[PDB]
Design a protein around this ligand. Sequence first.
Ligand SMILES: C=C1C[C@@]23C=CC(=O)[C@@](C)(CCC(=O)Nc4c(O)ccc(C(=O)O)c4O)[C@@H]2C[C@@H]1C[C@H]3O
Ligand SMILES: C=C1C[C@@]23C=CC(=O)[C@@](C)(CCC(=O)Nc4c(O)ccc(C(=O)O)c4O)[C@@H]2C[C@@H]1C[C@H]3O
Lengths: 411, 411
Amino acid sequence: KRRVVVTGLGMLSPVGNTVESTWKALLAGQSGISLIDHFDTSAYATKFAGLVKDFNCEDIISRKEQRKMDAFIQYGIVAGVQAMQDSGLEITEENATRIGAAIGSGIGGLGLIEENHTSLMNGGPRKISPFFVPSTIVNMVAGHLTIMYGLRGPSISIATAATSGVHNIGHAARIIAYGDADVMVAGGAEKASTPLGVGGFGAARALSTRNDNPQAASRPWDKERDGFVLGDGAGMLVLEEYEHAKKRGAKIYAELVGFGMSSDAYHMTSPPENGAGAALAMANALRDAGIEASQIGYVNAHGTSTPAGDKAEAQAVKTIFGEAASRVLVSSTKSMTGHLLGAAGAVESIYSILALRDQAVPPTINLDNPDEGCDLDFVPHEARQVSGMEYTLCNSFGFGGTNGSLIFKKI
Amino acid sequence: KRRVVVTGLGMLSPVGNTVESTWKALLAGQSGISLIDHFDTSAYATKFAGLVKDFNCEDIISRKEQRKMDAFIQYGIVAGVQAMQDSGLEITEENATRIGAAIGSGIGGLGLIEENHTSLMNGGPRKISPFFVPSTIVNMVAGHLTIMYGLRGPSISIATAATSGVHNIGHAARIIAYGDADVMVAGGAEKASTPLGVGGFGAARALSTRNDNPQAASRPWDKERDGFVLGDGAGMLVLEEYEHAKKRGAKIYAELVGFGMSSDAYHMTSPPENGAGAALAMANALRDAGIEASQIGYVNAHGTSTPAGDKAEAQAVKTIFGEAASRVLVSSTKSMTGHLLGAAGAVESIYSILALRDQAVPPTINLDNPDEGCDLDFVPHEARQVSGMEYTLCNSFGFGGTNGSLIFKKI
Ligand SMILES: C=C1C[C@@]23C=CC(=O)[C@@](C)(CCC(=O)Nc4c(O)ccc(C(=O)O)c4O)[C@@H]2C[C@@H]1C[C@H]3O
Ligand SMILES: C=C1C[C@@]23C=CC(=O)[C@@](C)(CCC(=O)Nc4c(O)ccc(C(=O)O)c4O)[C@@H]2C[C@@H]1C[C@H]3O
């Protein structure tokens, strides 16, 4: 039976352009939310987001290649290179066939979709860029990274809205465990802070409109919450079969032990009050890992800061953890980072892993006045020191009622 | 060890709005390509495509729900309902948790992306539809079908350009075999025949521009070929664990025995001359199925009608089949249907299955003057009667160099 471990990490987020800088900022409760300045937000109900500050790909992507990629792909590539470098893995003719990728995005290249469509409206199809398709489609991060590293193994890209990051990581692990690969770079990337992204999610009445205090906007489980805050970035993990990792002397961050999936079968853009779908996904991951709920020390929640979404997950956690419900720590790092959509489950899996390494759990900031009758410990305001934590669980749910949960185990 | 079989089929294509009507047309060598009339093609270099004729969802999708979905989702839903009905499966509180979906698309809702962006350009973000996001994103076919049927099991959506259909079907099978589900509705849907789709792929110099003879445009392996022909539609299969199918008396079309994946690691929009990536995917599927190349009776090719793409796959088939290379039949149904992109591998898996049932293989029409020095039997012009065919193989390759192959076995 093939075990899967994590041997490399890469990340760009609204609170940092590296894995360690991001983690340090989160443990310090720092918000990465600010006013948007790259497009005129005068007519927009929401005028802020979690932006990647000073993104730099100068020594990573050539000038000729950059022009063929939407920002989401550039972010995904940079984070993937960080992960591959961190892993110390060396690609050879002999193992190239055994290394692949599972990397997705929820919405893909909105920026270049807008640019190409604007061009078409203004001057006809002759003005569409030859790069339109490959610069926008969701699977292009995987495409570029395999070419860059000479990876010939399986490559897939799961696009399940906010569940993407978790599904790609989960299936990369399945692929390795099944025997189709020994290593996979997996994760997600997103850059939806554009007119269509902000305007689109705004049209759905899904975003916080707290323009007067952007850093206090994302407040999961707080009574004054009014929708999610969009965040940009990318998270990538190098997953690897255990004996393969040991043989080459890899550094091992944690083990990936459980992966659960479910569907709400309720409504396209809202969960059932019950949180039955969320619960089933967590139950499935626990069964996959062969452990009980009481063994989980921390749950990095989906917790987007929407009125109904946050309540359903709290109900789901209560259902699954029962008597232990008050003893597990639960936090939503989206309180600081915003919602990275297709990259959310990827960066949040990284947070779940580092929590095991450092035995420290990041807080749900802004939780000033929690919804009434719920006795869960949402790690409000300040990071928490933990002691003999062996397992963490990461939840990611998505439009369409698609759910996913991953469980990581220390060492 | 859990075996996976096919118990239901659903399909909309340019040659028919049902599984049997489509198959009858293909065995008869009928083209489904015609001039586009739903948008003004005056300024477009390519003015034809494979369109779904007289699509009807009146008794399937309510008027209230139709307005929330791009055409690709409406096609995917109709084909999924056809498959679920064909399967005879009855969803209960007891099995709901064991039934899921793996359905994707390569490009998603171009039609409604254009409509929403046009609205934004003309009147600001206030004019974007509240349905923008859920009406366009790739995972919405899976989302709607799970809600419609009350499916609570795993739902994923793989978006790997033209490889989508094969990857979704392959991973649905993996999910069942692993134990995460007993049944999965899997496949793909696409409706990229819009200004951005035709103009976008046209900008890349990837489409045939034979406007004076649209039905002769798609001509895989023919010397006068000049790019692919875009096709719309959707293909869905109900996959099911073997003992589960038998117990309820399901009708069984074929068994899914092998699934292989690879990456070219060559170029974003073209394969290597070698076809090494295509070859590895077929090799992987053969190994997964535990059989030799000589046992395959028919290969339904990726064969899009591009100069370099068709040559690389012919080289790959020669590499894998060697001495048997001239004895296996190879055909590209895209010669009649056009390229359904994210749905191509789904409808083509259906063709691969029916070929086993009927012991008949559809032709590569338009193959008037085959490229020189290649001795493969591409089933030119006319369908072929076969005799003791036990295995078929379906190839699907995609931008980003991502490849996939599936192998189906009779009974
Ligand atoms: C149907 C409704 C009712 C409505 C009312 C209260 C709410 O909380 C929101 C604002 C968001 C629900 C949600 O959490 N969806 C939801 C979900 O199910 C799965 C994933 C996500 C995600 O962000 O990743 C998500 O956001 C909904 C959205 C739309 C309009 C609002 O009035
Ligand atoms: C890089 C080039 C060179 C060029 C020259 C000859 C060709 O054949 C085409 C027209 C298409 C190659 C191809 O088959 N890609 C290709 C591929 O790798 C994987 C999938 C598909 C698919 O359609 O699903 C596909 O189409 C390419 C496209 C672009 C411009 C042309 O001059």
